[PDB]
């Protein structure tokens, strides 16, 4: 786990053989990570839309471990001010908002 | 409630005598709402930081009801692509991430 929100909900992830940190972001539809070298197929994707668009590489069905939970989901790889775990992967780990 | 994340976590809020909808956004430090007239004191605040800054009005200790929970917190008022409930108010309502 239960994570309070007094601080930014940053968690450890394992992806592409690397240990990283990322923000659990319920405001983000998608997961965007930088500085990861993923194997297998990708396609370009345009995201954002403020000031222009940002182009990222979309990798589907990527195995990823998020705070101990091994799941699978789409990961967008490209520049991002902060590594972000979006709703697409929070659903996979069974993460809910509770109050 | 327990809110799953397959869809955007949009909730009803009551603010400044108006009913509105806003996104529960654990990636946002602050709460930003558009098209609300709040009474009482404010100061300008610069937020964002990509492409420049956005100036908003900071109102402190604003009463707000979020999905039935009457709380108090800082509300930033300014045009925002989407109304956002940030961590500052999610803490007030006792909202946690759980998995």
């Amino acid at each position: 786990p239960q994570i309070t929100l007094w601080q930014r909900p940053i968690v450890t992830i394992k992806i592409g053989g690397q240990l990283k940190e990322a923000l659990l972001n319920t405001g983000a539809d998608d997961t965007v990570l930088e500085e990861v070298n993923l194997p297998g197929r990708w396609k370009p994707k345009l995201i954002g839309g403020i000031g222009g668009f940002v182009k990222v590489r979309q990798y589907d069905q990527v195995p990823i471990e998020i705070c101990g939970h091994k799941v699978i989901g789409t990961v967008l790889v490209g520049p991002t001010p902060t590594n972000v775990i979006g709703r697409n992967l929070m659903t996979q780990i069974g993460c809910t908002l509770n109050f | 409630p327990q809110i799953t994340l397959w869809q955007r976590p949009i909730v009803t809020i009551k603010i400044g005598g108006q009913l509105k909808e806003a996104l529960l956004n654990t990636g946002a430090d602050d709460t930003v709402l558009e098209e609300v007239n709040l009474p009482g004191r404010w100061k300008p605040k610069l937020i964002g930081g990509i492409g420049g800054f956005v100036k908003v009005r900071q109102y402190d200790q604003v009463p707000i009801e979020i999905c039935g929970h009457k709380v108090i917190g800082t509300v930033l008022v300014g045009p925002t692509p989407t109304n956002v409930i940030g961590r500052n108010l999610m803490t007030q309502i006792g909202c946690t991430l759980n998995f």
């Binding site: 923000l23 972001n25 405001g27 983000a28 539809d29 998608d30 965007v32 994707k45 345009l46 995201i47 954002g48 839309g49 001010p81 902060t82 972000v84 979006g86 | 955007r8 956004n25 990636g27 946002a28 430090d29 602050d30 930003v32 937020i47 964002g48 930081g49 692509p81 989407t82 956002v84």
Partner: peptide, 7 residues
């Protein structure tokens, strides 16, 4: 912070 994605 103001973190997002839509997209």
């Amino acid at each position: 912070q103001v973190n997002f994605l839509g997209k």
